[PDB]
Design a protein around this ligand. Structure first.
Ligand SMILES: *C/C(=C\CCCC=O)CCC=O
Ligand SMILES: *C/C(=C\CCCC=O)CCC=O
Lengths: 329, 427, 111
């Protein structure tokens, strides 16, 4: 077995199993390491900047710098700090005497920084931009998103900033980033609809419609029936009175509390009235609704039964949706 | 004790799998496989009681069907135009789907699974298909990257506009796993597939409380992705999270998490290390769903006397911050509860008016960001509010005696969080 | 070294070839070379002899001005015609046709 160790195969295999993506190339790696008997390293979680001290110790072991694990725990280096280590900290605080060793460390780190998933910290996918200039640049992501630069700001940065702030050390690299930055200078109460419905019965259809209509470019509002405060929920109706289109979800008996609501206190009743008041485009959606006597409703809302409604079908959902949209104004 | 029963099981179950393997040879037209399927499905369902009887006997029975069992024959049974029994195969496959089977079917079954996913209308089938997809998604970076692009996501999204508890629960759990296990790329694609707006139905259904929690865990994790944050925010489903975490009780859902069968969301060091991100985000809709869940586990794991998990997962210090620099009642109630459930003392919130702080409040915050080593030096030099906000590296090094650059750096990082929460009205 | 910077440097002067690795590590390639500064060459790429820098740099600056539809598809039985399939593709690709092959392994994605 001594062959492989000396050939420099074992550590190479470990990397194929640490920073792996492909199943095959990693299966093979695991197998080989087991066949040699040497323990097989678990893959690294790629989201480095959210790593705790535990994951830093694991990677310190899989790139074989175990000599140093202790110092890294005593100084409780975690994800964020790791990605930001300087030569000085490494030398002094973490106690890596040898320049050559520092150099091998950084080389291993740069491989990490390049595999990292920086999603939690990078709102502008600066990673992919830097990665387009040159795949080796992706390693500077975290350093740039920490000085807060994003894609929009990048056009303004100076060589000096890149050097000191973001810790890009190689002049050549600065210069290319900076240049491509400068080419990025020129390359950087009224919803439409309201859905009123019984939260107990029509809650389903309500959401479903909103989604569908939002896809189709209508800003919708929903009858969030939970609130009674603020002058008998006047804010509730500011939305309805302003909502050009009014979808009413007519489930089997959706007009119960509306029925003979003379205090105009039931939110559904209220809304119907205020929509009718404002002369709003009322489209009833029929999903098991049996049409009552208008007389059983207060007069202020009786006429809502006199709006032509659309038959709901879950089966041909999309077709139904198109018709509803047609009825909206 | 456990093994004896597992062995006992296999002694019946393996020949029963062979009794099935005999039937597995034919089709379900004449219920030749149909009965066989009904048998072995219910046989591993009788053996699905065994994980409960013991602790995850699932492996034993599964390995049987995998290594030499008709695992591949069931995959071919799906392909077989015996739709009536292809759902029965699916039902069985959904059951027998431990990590072992998952990897194996990622190599072979994956193709056939998706080929069967394109079949939509049969509801019972869809339930079991969304089911296998749910387990599939939680396999590997590349497994998501596959399914997503191949219309696996498009399957669960088209089944998210249906009306069936199990179907919907599954879809929710899927988009959950898909968001979590998949990469940056996978996630972007979901949000651009309009997945955030499609979770709204699930999260907006008072009828089912567990569906909601699952649906919201999903949308919450998407909002942690800063790059797609806004798109999830404007979806509307993100506002819908915080009320929900208030309604339910972590304890109540902790009981419902005991019997998750590690198929939905079973207790484990994995899930904990994947919640800590949430607890540690910007979004408080995430830090709520964060705490809620990590609190549900803070119950079970203390009952199992394995608290050491959280400490190592890096959950305790995260929880402390949610209770130190808090504003929201809920996210802070939850945090307090969790820390108590782990037993670790619960930190009192910090008064935010930093610059009017006396030496006493500086000592308290030094303790809640755990730099107690240093409290003494801070008292001896009587640092108070004003001085704290003005500390330089030099003073920290020399006067306060923080030797380590790396430690200075972690200090300043904690300080900057303070300075940002501060109420500076007096000044 | 993707750009054979080795041979370029080696043409200036065989003694220069020694700077290859130092230049390919700062990532410079042939296309970028026209833009480098004396300072970069010194610090980044570790060329130490001014005289040498100067010659490289100069020759760099002279390199400023001196830097669903394939044509064909082959359908065949993978069991029998697999041989001829490949053979044709190769031959036709040599002859300036972009070809496509009946990779019969896939059933998913709407039949
Ligand atoms: C087996 C392991 C990873 C390979 C992933 C297969 C994906 O298709 C993990 C065990 C590591 O030692
Ligand atoms: C219970 C405590 C704070 C939560 C505030 C609730 C607001 O709605 C304080 C005790 C801290 O340990």
């Amino acid at each position: 077995t001594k062959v492989f160790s000396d050939i420099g195969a074992i550590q190479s295999l470990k990397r194929l199993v640490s920073y792996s993506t492909n199943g095959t190339k990693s299966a093979l790696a695991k197998r080989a390491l087991r066949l040699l008997g040497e323990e097989v390293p678990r893959p690294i979680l790629p989201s480095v900047p959210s790593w705790k001290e535990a994951e830093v110790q694991t990677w310190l072991q899989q790139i074989g710098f175990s000599k140093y694990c202790e110092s890294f725990r005593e100084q409780q280096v975690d994800g964020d700090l790791l990605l930001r280590l300087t030569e000085e900290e490494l030398q002094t605080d973490l106690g890596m005497k040898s320049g050559i060793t520092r150099k091998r460390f950084f080389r291993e780190l740069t491989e990490l920084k390049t595999f990292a998933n920086y999603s939690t910290c990078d709102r502008s996918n600066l990673a992919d931009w830097l990665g387009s200039l040159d795949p080796r640049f992706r390693q500077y992501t975290y350093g740039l998103v920490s000085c807060g630069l994003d894609r929009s700001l990048l056009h303004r940065v100076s060589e000096q900033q890149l050097l000191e702030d973001c810790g890009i050390h190689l002049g050549v690299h600065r210069a290319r980033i900076l240049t491509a930055a400068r080419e990025m200078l020129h390359s950087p109460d009224t919803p439409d609809v309201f859905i009123s419905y019984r939260r107990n019965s029509g809650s389903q259809l309500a959401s479903l419609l909103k989604v569908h209509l939002q896809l189709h470019g209508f800003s919708v509002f929903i009858d969030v029936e939970k609130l009674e405060a603020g002058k008998f929920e006047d804010k509730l109706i500011q939305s309805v009175m302003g909502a050009r289109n009014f979808v009413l979800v007519l489930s089997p008996g959706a007009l119960d509390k509306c029925m003979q609501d003379h205090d105009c206190k039931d939110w559904v009743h209220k809304q119907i009235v205020t929509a009718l008041s404002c002369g709003k485009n009322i489209v009833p959606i029929i999903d098991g609704f049996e049409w009552p006597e208008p007389q059983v409703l207060p007069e202020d809302m009786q006429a809502v039964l006199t709006f032509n409604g659309i038959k709901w079908s879950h089966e041909y959902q999309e077709a139904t949706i198109e018709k509803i949209i047609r009825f909206l104004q | 004790g456990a093994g004896t029963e597992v062995q006992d099981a296999l002694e019946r179950a393996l020949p029963e799998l062979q009794q099935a393997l005999s039937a597995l040879k034919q089709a379900g037209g004449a219920r030749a496989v149909g009965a066989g399927l009904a048998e072995v499905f219910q046989l591993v369902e009788e053996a699905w009681l065994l994980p409960a009887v013991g602790r995850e006997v699932a492996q034993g029975l599964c390995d049987a069907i995998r290594l030499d069992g008709g695992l591949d024959l069931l995959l071919r049974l799906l392909q077989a135009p015996e739709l009536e029994t292809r759902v029965q195969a699916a039902r069985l496959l959904e059951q027998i789907l431990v990590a072992e089977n998952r990897d194996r079917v990622a190599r072979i079954g994956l193709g056939v699974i998706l080929n069967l996913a394109k079949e939509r209308e049969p509801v019972e089938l869809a339930r079991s298909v969304a089911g296998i997809l749910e387990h599939m998604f939680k396999h590997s970076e590349e497994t998501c990257q596959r399914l997503v692009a191949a219309g696996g996501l498009d399957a669960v999204l088209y089944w998210c506009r249906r009306t069936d508890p199990a179907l919907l629960r599954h879809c929710a759990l899927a988009l959950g796993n898909c968001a979590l296990h998949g990469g940056q790329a996978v996630q972007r694609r979901m949000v651009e597939k309009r997945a955030a707006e499609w979770l709204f139905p699930l999260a907006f259904s008072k009828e089912d409380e567990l569906l909601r929690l699952h649906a919201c865990l999903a949308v919450a994790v998407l909002a942690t992705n800063k790059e797609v944050e806004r798109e999830v925010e404007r979806s509307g489903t993100l506002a819908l999270v915080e009320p929900l975490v208030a309604s339910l009780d972590p304890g109540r859902f902790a009981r419902c998490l005991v019997d998750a069968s590690d198929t939905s969301q079973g207790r484990g060091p994995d899930d904990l290390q994947r919640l800590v991100p949430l607890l540690d985000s910007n979004r408080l809709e995430a830090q709520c769903i964060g705490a809620f869940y990590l609190c549900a586990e803070a119950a079970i794991k203390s009952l199992q006397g394995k608290t050491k998990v959280f400490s190592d997962i890096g959950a305790i210090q995260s929880l402390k911050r949610l209770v130190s620099y808090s504003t929201n009642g809920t996210k802070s109630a939850l945090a307090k509860r969790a820390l108590r459930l782990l037993g670790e003392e619960v930190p009192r919130p910090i008064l935010p008016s930093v610059p009017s702080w006396k030496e006493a409040e500086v000592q308290t915050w030094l303790q809640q960001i755990g730099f107690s080593k240093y409290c003494e030096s801070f008292r001896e030099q009587q640092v108070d509010g004003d001085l704290l906000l003005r500390l330089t590296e030099e003073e920290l090094q020399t006067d306060l005696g923080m030797k380590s650059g790396i430690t200075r750096k972690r200090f300043f990082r904690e300080l900057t969080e303070l300075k940002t929460f501060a109420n500076y009205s007096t000044c």
